[PDB]
Each structure stands twice: as C-alpha cells, then as structure tokens.
Amino acid sequence: ETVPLILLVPKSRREDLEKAQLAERMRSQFFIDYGVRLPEVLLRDGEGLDDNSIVLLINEIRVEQFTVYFDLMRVVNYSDEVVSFGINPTIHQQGSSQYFWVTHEEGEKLREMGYVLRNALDELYHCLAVTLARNVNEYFGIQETKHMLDQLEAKFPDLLKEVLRH
C-alpha cells in the first residue's frame, strides 16, 4: 500500500490523538488481527469538524464518517438494564444500528455488573476495521456477480420471465 489513510479529526483533539499514538495503535492492531499491513495513517485537522467526529479519507475521497465520543466509553454489550442502574447513555444512531456510551465513572460501575466497555480509541479502531471489512466483502460480491454474468446461459427475456414467476 503506497497511498496513506487520512483521518480528519477535531482540531481540539488532534494533539491528544498524536500523543496517544493513534496511528501506530491502528497499524499495529490491524496487523495483529488480520495479518495485513495498513498504509501510513495520517491525522489532519478537520475544518468545521465538530467534536466527536472523524472522517476517513482514502486517496482524498471520503470513505466514512465516525462518531466516537472521545471522553466516553462504549457499552459493547449494552442492554436496557443499564438505565435501571440510574445510567442514561449517550446514544448514537447510524442506519439500523445504535451505539451506547457512558462516562468513565459509569463505565467502571457497569464493568462490575457484567458489561464490556471499549474506550474511544479502541472503538475508533473498531470502526475503521468494520469499514475496511465491509468494503472488502462488497468487493468480493462484485466479483461473484461478474462470475454469474459469465456463467449465465439464459437470455434476458427468459431470465426475467423466470424471476417474475418466483
């Protein structure tokens, strides 16, 4: 890989993320989990970028925008019982999926009650790995479709007749 991954980050978080060595954390973890070598990961200030937002660019094209609450912890196996403990999560919603976040102090209480918590940087890594994995799956899917159009012996009218039937 010769083209770097770029993460646009909030201007107020950039120096903390550099001090936390986010780039090396990401590169190191991805290699251990997958055996694949990420290109260099560069952080850049995102103009107008609100807090808790990260934009992934590859080859200067926007790939995905993540919502990660830098000062909070993600409740990985969140259940509604959390609320019965007096803890009301920060909820982020992306499509059909909800993500539940709590304070560091709340996180420590939930860890004693069977919950698993991920800090923001670990969740940011997780978001990247999920995005990278989703894109690879779809790429393979495109290839499967090309193979089916190669193997296809039925013509279009006959093919479309069969589809409406079933």
Author numbering: 358 to 523
Question: What do the paper's sentences say?
Answer:
Protein type III secretion systems (T3SSs) are organic nanosyringes that achieve an energy-dependent translocation of bacterial proteins through the two membranes of Gram-negative organisms. InvA is a member of a set of several inner membrane proteins that form this core of the T3SS. Highly conserved across pathogenic bacteria, as well as with a conserved homolog in the flagellar system (FlhA), InvA is critical to the functioning of the T3SS. InvA of S. typhimurium is 685 amino acids in length and the N-terminal 300 amino acids are comprised of seven transmembrane helices.
